[PDB]
Amino acid sequence: RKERDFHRMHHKRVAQEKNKLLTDLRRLKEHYAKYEPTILELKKKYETLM
Amino acid sequence: RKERDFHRMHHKRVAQEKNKLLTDLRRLKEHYAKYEPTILELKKKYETLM
Amino acid sequence: WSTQVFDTIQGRLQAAVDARDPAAIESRLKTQYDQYLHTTNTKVAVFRDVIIEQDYNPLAAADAAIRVPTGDIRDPL
Amino acid sequence: FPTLEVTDVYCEGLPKQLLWQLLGLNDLNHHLRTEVTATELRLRAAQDRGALTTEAASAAMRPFLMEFGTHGLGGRPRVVHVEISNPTPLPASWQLHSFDDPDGVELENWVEPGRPRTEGERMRDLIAEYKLFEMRPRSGELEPGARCTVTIEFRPSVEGSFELPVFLHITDGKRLRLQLQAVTTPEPLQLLALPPPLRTFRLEPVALGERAPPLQMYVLRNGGPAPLHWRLDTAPLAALAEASWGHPVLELVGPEEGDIEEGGVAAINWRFSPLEAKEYRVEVPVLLGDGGIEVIELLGRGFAPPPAPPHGAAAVQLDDDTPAAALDSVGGDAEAEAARAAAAADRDWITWRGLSSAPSAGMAGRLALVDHDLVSLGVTPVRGLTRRIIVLTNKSRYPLAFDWDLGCLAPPPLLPASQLQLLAGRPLQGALAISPAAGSLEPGERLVCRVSLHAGVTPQVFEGEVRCHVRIDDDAVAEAEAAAAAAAAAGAAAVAAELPFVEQVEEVIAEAPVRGPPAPPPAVAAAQRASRLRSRLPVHQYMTTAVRTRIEPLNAAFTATMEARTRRLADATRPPSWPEPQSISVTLRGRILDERQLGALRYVPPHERAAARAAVVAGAAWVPPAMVPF
């Protein structure tokens, strides 16, 4: 039981850290999907200019 | 004993997944850092072309 | 959670509420309420927590209630 | 050591011999029977303390392939019933284990295995997600001689290939890995039945100077996908003939091409006529409708018989079958008996210790039982009429229509002795018949069916499969229902006789005040009230009209619950009986042998040499003479 509890908390804390990384990844992805349409619009203006 | 073995294998697996997620997050940070200079570069080229 | 707890408790609630005949329920509640009516009409006053539990014992109604046992819960685990 | 044995395996529409061969159960039974198990102790030690890993265990455990072949997408799932028994007196406890699958551990807020990023583990995880491979009993325990009836089922719902390793893990004993290998094709791509014993077909050794080499039958099955268009290139055989001083060897007798239907049987006859005692390895390709090789290797040897005595000094006629002395007598060559033993392990299911040749598994859910599956017709003379009996029993409470079909064993449209030329081009070179072609059978009624084989002039060895189709007798059940209806009508007539001319209101014409149904007697009203209060709608789920108007989602939930309660009645009202028609099949193997070959016991298996000698010395097989033409 002692060994089981030790491995339980190691596994759980690792899983929690993985979930935190996933949330951070979501945040950055949203933050830069905000920027991407500006690049697309500049591309359209560039093409029209040529 | 079954629980401790189970938690050991899944602890190792989630640690590996966390490491992979960290590497992917670094690559994503690189790409996002590549994003923002493109807006400035496109703006300057747009001005020069027009 | 549904199947282990709620389905089990509702299934045990049924086949007990269903088992109870409506006529028996009516007769039971009638005996109780007529006992209360008789003690109200005879005695000058009615008090809770003061009854003699001899002429009128209302808690028998609570005794004659469906009791359901318990099994196991998955959410609490 | 407490071990296990597979006695028999049942699957839908597949020969028992073919299933045993595909699962390679000979090797499994051998390994589970005898092994020192030196490394299995280390394997158990690693299983303890959690050191074992699936990949390392598979790499070190020598997996055995559980081949389910290819399945068309959306086809019926395939079920495998395996009977596990204890040969050893010690009771045997066994635990099918696979670390990917749960090991009896309670999961509480533990994230499911993440993105594997390796396609092998990914395929394993999709198997786990969509229950593609499932074994029902999981862990079990058996007393000596018990039967467990394990079931393993595969669900062809996803596309692509799938390999899942599990291992038997007997508590005290050997631990063998089984790799369930299957592919589910979203598109029809023909894949011929390709078991390892059939890929390298071990030809039975034959006499060097045999007047007529025995036709040997090779059976091809379509498998899961669309019907298979096969064509066999004779060019390698022609090259062999050219190398062999222009003599025909390993000749094909049937058609060069053919079109096997889905789940069908096609038989091809080979003539092995050797010129030396050396091994004759010949490799032939099989071109399918779509591009494919499916190459087949044929191996045979030379018998090198004892020199034929001159007529003056011939052995007069009026040695034990079991010992290896019999094998040595059937071919003096050292490797001829080795080839014969290899062919026996390849095709003769009788010699396999584990197999029981009994219905065994599948007791539940089968409409009927053949008392003795895997029946062997005895070795027969040239024009021999050999009969056996097979009894069929209806376990179902419903009548069963029993029809008989022959895959490649059909007679040409018994046979007249003079006109045996009709047998030309026929894979069997015989006429199989069964006394009941198609008969109805009441529940719990056992029927005797006489299977009779009338052989032709060409010596042959056949290992065919005969199908029996069992269906629920709609005519019989309808007749029973009609009889019940007639009885009800008679009872109604009796009631009418009791009460003369009971009035029934035909219709109503402008009943000026609206008249409701007549009031039931108070006791009946109370009973109807109690019936209504039964199946009362649950308290937490009953939304009053006010609450439904106030809260739309509660109104939608109430409507959904009403729809569900209405739906619940339909399933009960539907008669769940009348299961699907079931096709059982029995494998028949026999040896049509020439008189010379029978007298010399040239090709009789050692298992039946006693019967062969009996039939030679004292006439034990009938030869229907009929009437001579002249």
PDB file of N, CA and C in Angstrom, chain D residues 157-210:
ATOM      1  N   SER D 157     -15.558  -3.418 -37.726  1.00  0.00           N
ATOM      2  CA  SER D 157     -16.217  -2.132 -37.904  1.00  0.00           C
ATOM      3  C   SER D 157     -15.275  -1.029 -38.361  1.00  0.00           C
ATOM      4  N   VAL D 158     -13.993  -1.128 -38.038  1.00  0.00           N
ATOM      5  CA  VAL D 158     -13.023  -0.121 -38.402  1.00  0.00           C
ATOM      6  C   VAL D 158     -12.275  -0.625 -39.632  1.00  0.00           C
ATOM      7  N   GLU D 159     -11.614   0.282 -40.342  1.00  0.00           N
ATOM      8  CA  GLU D 159     -10.803  -0.064 -41.499  1.00  0.00           C
ATOM      9  C   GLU D 159      -9.350  -0.250 -41.077  1.00  0.00           C
ATOM     10  N   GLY D 160      -8.611  -1.010 -41.876  1.00  0.00           N
ATOM     11  CA  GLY D 160      -7.190  -1.181 -41.647  1.00  0.00           C
ATOM     12  C   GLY D 160      -6.867  -2.480 -40.936  1.00  0.00           C
ATOM     13  N   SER D 161      -5.576  -2.665 -40.685  1.00  0.00           N
ATOM     14  CA  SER D 161      -5.082  -3.861 -40.022  1.00  0.00           C
ATOM     15  C   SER D 161      -5.043  -3.662 -38.511  1.00  0.00           C
ATOM     16  N   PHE D 162      -5.017  -4.781 -37.789  1.00  0.00           N
ATOM     17  CA  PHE D 162      -5.038  -4.768 -36.331  1.00  0.00           C
ATOM     18  C   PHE D 162      -4.361  -6.026 -35.814  1.00  0.00           C
ATOM     19  N   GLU D 163      -3.317  -5.841 -35.010  1.00  0.00           N
ATOM     20  CA  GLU D 163      -2.629  -6.939 -34.344  1.00  0.00           C
ATOM     21  C   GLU D 163      -2.609  -6.658 -32.851  1.00  0.00           C
ATOM     22  N   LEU D 164      -3.179  -7.571 -32.069  1.00  0.00           N
ATOM     23  CA  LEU D 164      -3.282  -7.409 -30.623  1.00  0.00           C
ATOM     24  C   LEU D 164      -2.660  -8.604 -29.915  1.00  0.00           C
ATOM     25  N   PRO D 165      -1.600  -8.420 -29.141  1.00  0.00           N
ATOM     26  CA  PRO D 165      -1.041  -9.544 -28.383  1.00  0.00           C
ATOM     27  C   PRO D 165      -1.620  -9.674 -26.980  1.00  0.00           C
ATOM     28  N   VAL D 166      -2.082 -10.876 -26.639  1.00  0.00           N
ATOM     29  CA  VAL D 166      -2.488 -11.238 -25.288  1.00  0.00           C
ATOM     30  C   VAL D 166      -1.656 -12.470 -24.927  1.00  0.00           C
ATOM     31  N   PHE D 167      -1.689 -12.891 -23.663  1.00  0.00           N
ATOM     32  CA  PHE D 167      -1.025 -14.142 -23.330  1.00  0.00           C
ATOM     33  C   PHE D 167      -1.850 -14.929 -22.321  1.00  0.00           C
ATOM     34  N   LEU D 168      -1.690 -16.256 -22.378  1.00  0.00           N
ATOM     35  CA  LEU D 168      -2.547 -17.158 -21.613  1.00  0.00           C
ATOM     36  C   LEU D 168      -2.304 -17.031 -20.116  1.00  0.00           C
ATOM     37  N   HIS D 169      -1.041 -17.103 -19.692  1.00  0.00           N
ATOM     38  CA  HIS D 169      -0.657 -16.891 -18.298  1.00  0.00           C
ATOM     39  C   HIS D 169      -1.408 -17.852 -17.366  1.00  0.00           C
ATOM     40  N   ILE D 170      -1.079 -19.136 -17.512  1.00  0.00           N
ATOM     41  CA  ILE D 170      -1.502 -20.110 -16.514  1.00  0.00           C
ATOM     42  C   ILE D 170      -0.801 -19.794 -15.199  1.00  0.00           C
ATOM     43  N   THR D 171      -1.543 -19.905 -14.093  1.00  0.00           N
ATOM     44  CA  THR D 171      -1.033 -19.455 -12.799  1.00  0.00           C
ATOM     45  C   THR D 171       0.270 -20.154 -12.438  1.00  0.00           C
ATOM     46  N   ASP D 172       0.303 -21.477 -12.557  1.00  0.00           N
ATOM     47  CA  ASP D 172       1.521 -22.252 -12.326  1.00  0.00           C
ATOM     48  C   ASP D 172       1.756 -23.097 -13.571  1.00  0.00           C
ATOM     49  N   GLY D 173       2.625 -22.625 -14.443  1.00  0.00           N
ATOM     50  CA  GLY D 173       2.895 -23.312 -15.682  1.00  0.00           C
ATOM     51  C   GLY D 173       3.369 -22.334 -16.736  1.00  0.00           C
ATOM     52  N   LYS D 174       3.232 -22.759 -17.986  1.00  0.00           N
ATOM     53  CA  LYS D 174       3.743 -21.990 -19.108  1.00  0.00           C
ATOM     54  C   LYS D 174       2.871 -20.772 -19.378  1.00  0.00           C
ATOM     55  N   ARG D 175       3.480 -19.756 -19.981  1.00  0.00           N
ATOM     56  CA  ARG D 175       2.772 -18.554 -20.406  1.00  0.00           C
ATOM     57  C   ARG D 175       3.102 -18.318 -21.872  1.00  0.00           C
ATOM     58  N   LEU D 176       2.121 -18.531 -22.742  1.00  0.00           N
ATOM     59  CA  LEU D 176       2.295 -18.399 -24.179  1.00  0.00           C
ATOM     60  C   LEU D 176       1.518 -17.199 -24.698  1.00  0.00           C
ATOM     61  N   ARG D 177       2.118 -16.495 -25.651  1.00  0.00           N
ATOM     62  CA  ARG D 177       1.529 -15.297 -26.224  1.00  0.00           C
ATOM     63  C   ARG D 177       0.759 -15.655 -27.484  1.00  0.00           C
ATOM     64  N   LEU D 178      -0.451 -15.123 -27.603  1.00  0.00           N
ATOM     65  CA  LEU D 178      -1.259 -15.231 -28.806  1.00  0.00           C
ATOM     66  C   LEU D 178      -1.436 -13.844 -29.408  1.00  0.00           C
ATOM     67  N   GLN D 179      -1.087 -13.710 -30.680  1.00  0.00           N
ATOM     68  CA  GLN D 179      -1.170 -12.448 -31.405  1.00  0.00           C
ATOM     69  C   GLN D 179      -2.370 -12.516 -32.341  1.00  0.00           C
ATOM     70  N   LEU D 180      -3.484 -11.917 -31.928  1.00  0.00           N
ATOM     71  CA  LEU D 180      -4.665 -11.836 -32.777  1.00  0.00           C
ATOM     72  C   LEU D 180      -4.368 -10.908 -33.945  1.00  0.00           C
ATOM     73  N   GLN D 181      -4.278 -11.470 -35.145  1.00  0.00           N
ATOM     74  CA  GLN D 181      -3.942 -10.725 -36.350  1.00  0.00           C
ATOM     75  C   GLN D 181      -5.132 -10.722 -37.296  1.00  0.00           C
ATOM     76  N   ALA D 182      -5.615  -9.530 -37.645  1.00  0.00           N
ATOM     77  CA  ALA D 182      -6.735  -9.420 -38.565  1.00  0.00           C
ATOM     78  C   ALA D 182      -6.586  -8.143 -39.374  1.00  0.00           C
ATOM     79  N   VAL D 183      -7.270  -8.101 -40.512  1.00  0.00           N
ATOM     80  CA  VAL D 183      -7.327  -6.903 -41.344  1.00  0.00           C
ATOM     81  C   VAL D 183      -8.766  -6.717 -41.796  1.00  0.00           C
ATOM     82  N   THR D 184      -9.283  -5.500 -41.677  1.00  0.00           N
ATOM     83  CA  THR D 184     -10.627  -5.171 -42.133  1.00  0.00           C
ATOM     84  C   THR D 184     -10.499  -4.283 -43.359  1.00  0.00           C
ATOM     85  N   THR D 185     -10.896  -4.813 -44.509  1.00  0.00           N
ATOM     86  CA  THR D 185     -10.726  -4.104 -45.768  1.00  0.00           C
ATOM     87  C   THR D 185     -11.969  -3.285 -46.072  1.00  0.00           C
ATOM     88  N   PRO D 186     -11.873  -1.957 -46.146  1.00  0.00           N
ATOM     89  CA  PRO D 186     -13.017  -1.170 -46.624  1.00  0.00           C
ATOM     90  C   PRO D 186     -13.377  -1.462 -48.063  1.00  0.00           C
ATOM     91  N   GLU D 187     -12.468  -2.045 -48.836  1.00  0.00           N
ATOM     92  CA  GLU D 187     -12.709  -2.322 -50.238  1.00  0.00           C
ATOM     93  C   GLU D 187     -12.499  -3.801 -50.528  1.00  0.00           C
ATOM     94  N   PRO D 188     -13.172  -4.340 -51.540  1.00  0.00           N
ATOM     95  CA  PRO D 188     -13.022  -5.768 -51.840  1.00  0.00           C
ATOM     96  C   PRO D 188     -11.714  -6.085 -52.543  1.00  0.00           C
ATOM     97  N   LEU D 189     -10.813  -6.771 -51.845  1.00  0.00           N
ATOM     98  CA  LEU D 189      -9.546  -7.218 -52.414  1.00  0.00           C
ATOM     99  C   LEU D 189      -9.398  -8.699 -52.110  1.00  0.00           C
ATOM    100  N   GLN D 190      -9.446  -9.520 -53.155  1.00  0.00           N
ATOM    101  CA  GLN D 190      -9.453 -10.966 -52.986  1.00  0.00           C
ATOM    102  C   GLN D 190      -8.194 -11.441 -52.274  1.00  0.00           C
ATOM    103  N   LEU D 191      -8.381 -12.287 -51.266  1.00  0.00           N
ATOM    104  CA  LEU D 191      -7.277 -12.879 -50.516  1.00  0.00           C
ATOM    105  C   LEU D 191      -7.621 -14.338 -50.259  1.00  0.00           C
ATOM    106  N   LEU D 192      -6.963 -15.240 -50.981  1.00  0.00           N
ATOM    107  CA  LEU D 192      -7.255 -16.659 -50.866  1.00  0.00           C
ATOM    108  C   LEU D 192      -6.905 -17.171 -49.475  1.00  0.00           C
ATOM    109  N   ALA D 193      -7.626 -18.204 -49.043  1.00  0.00           N
ATOM    110  CA  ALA D 193      -7.349 -18.825 -47.754  1.00  0.00           C
ATOM    111  C   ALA D 193      -5.913 -19.320 -47.721  1.00  0.00           C
ATOM    112  N   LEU D 194      -5.096 -18.704 -46.871  1.00  0.00           N
ATOM    113  CA  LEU D 194      -3.647 -18.889 -46.893  1.00  0.00           C
ATOM    114  C   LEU D 194      -3.135 -19.244 -45.502  1.00  0.00           C
ATOM    115  N   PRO D 195      -3.444 -20.440 -45.010  1.00  0.00           N
ATOM    116  CA  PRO D 195      -2.823 -20.910 -43.774  1.00  0.00           C
ATOM    117  C   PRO D 195      -1.432 -21.449 -44.053  1.00  0.00           C
ATOM    118  N   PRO D 196      -0.520 -21.357 -43.091  1.00  0.00           N
ATOM    119  CA  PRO D 196       0.855 -21.827 -43.315  1.00  0.00           C
ATOM    120  C   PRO D 196       0.913 -23.295 -43.708  1.00  0.00           C
ATOM    121  N   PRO D 197       0.102 -24.177 -43.107  1.00  0.00           N
ATOM    122  CA  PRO D 197       0.098 -25.567 -43.594  1.00  0.00           C
ATOM    123  C   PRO D 197      -0.381 -25.715 -45.024  1.00  0.00           C
ATOM    124  N   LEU D 198      -1.203 -24.791 -45.519  1.00  0.00           N
ATOM    125  CA  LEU D 198      -1.673 -24.899 -46.894  1.00  0.00           C
ATOM    126  C   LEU D 198      -0.725 -24.231 -47.883  1.00  0.00           C
ATOM    127  N   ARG D 199       0.056 -23.246 -47.434  1.00  0.00           N
ATOM    128  CA  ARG D 199       1.002 -22.586 -48.327  1.00  0.00           C
ATOM    129  C   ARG D 199       2.035 -23.572 -48.850  1.00  0.00           C
ATOM    130  N   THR D 200       2.576 -24.399 -47.967  1.00  0.00           N
ATOM    131  CA  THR D 200       3.532 -25.439 -48.329  1.00  0.00           C
ATOM    132  C   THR D 200       2.806 -26.769 -48.165  1.00  0.00           C
ATOM    133  N   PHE D 201       2.096 -27.176 -49.210  1.00  0.00           N
ATOM    134  CA  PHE D 201       1.274 -28.374 -49.143  1.00  0.00           C
ATOM    135  C   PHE D 201       2.171 -29.601 -49.207  1.00  0.00           C
ATOM    136  N   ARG D 202       2.236 -30.346 -48.109  1.00  0.00           N
ATOM    137  CA  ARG D 202       3.093 -31.524 -48.028  1.00  0.00           C
ATOM    138  C   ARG D 202       2.410 -32.676 -48.744  1.00  0.00           C
ATOM    139  N   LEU D 203       2.838 -32.931 -49.974  1.00  0.00           N
ATOM    140  CA  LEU D 203       2.281 -34.026 -50.751  1.00  0.00           C
ATOM    141  C   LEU D 203       2.628 -35.357 -50.105  1.00  0.00           C
ATOM    142  N   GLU D 204       1.672 -36.275 -50.104  1.00  0.00           N
ATOM    143  CA  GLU D 204       1.943 -37.593 -49.558  1.00  0.00           C
ATOM    144  C   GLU D 204       2.940 -38.323 -50.455  1.00  0.00           C
ATOM    145  N   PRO D 205       3.947 -38.971 -49.877  1.00  0.00           N
ATOM    146  CA  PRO D 205       4.912 -39.710 -50.698  1.00  0.00           C
ATOM    147  C   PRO D 205       4.216 -40.783 -51.517  1.00  0.00           C
ATOM    148  N   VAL D 206       4.679 -40.962 -52.752  1.00  0.00           N
ATOM    149  CA  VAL D 206       4.022 -41.852 -53.697  1.00  0.00           C
ATOM    150  C   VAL D 206       5.040 -42.784 -54.331  1.00  0.00           C
ATOM    151  N   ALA D 207       4.546 -43.927 -54.807  1.00  0.00           N
ATOM    152  CA  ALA D 207       5.405 -44.930 -55.419  1.00  0.00           C
ATOM    153  C   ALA D 207       6.047 -44.385 -56.684  1.00  0.00           C
ATOM    154  N   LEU D 208       7.321 -44.725 -56.878  1.00  0.00           N
ATOM    155  CA  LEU D 208       8.037 -44.246 -58.053  1.00  0.00           C
ATOM    156  C   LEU D 208       7.400 -44.763 -59.337  1.00  0.00           C
ATOM    157  N   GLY D 209       7.046 -46.041 -59.369  1.00  0.00           N
ATOM    158  CA  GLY D 209       6.469 -46.627 -60.560  1.00  0.00           C
ATOM    159  C   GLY D 209       4.978 -46.869 -60.468  1.00  0.00           C
ATOM    160  N   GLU D 210       4.281 -46.083 -59.648  1.00  0.00           N
ATOM    161  CA  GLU D 210       2.846 -46.272 -59.479  1.00  0.00           C
ATOM    162  C   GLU D 210       2.130 -46.148 -60.814  1.00  0.00           C
TER     163      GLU D 210
END
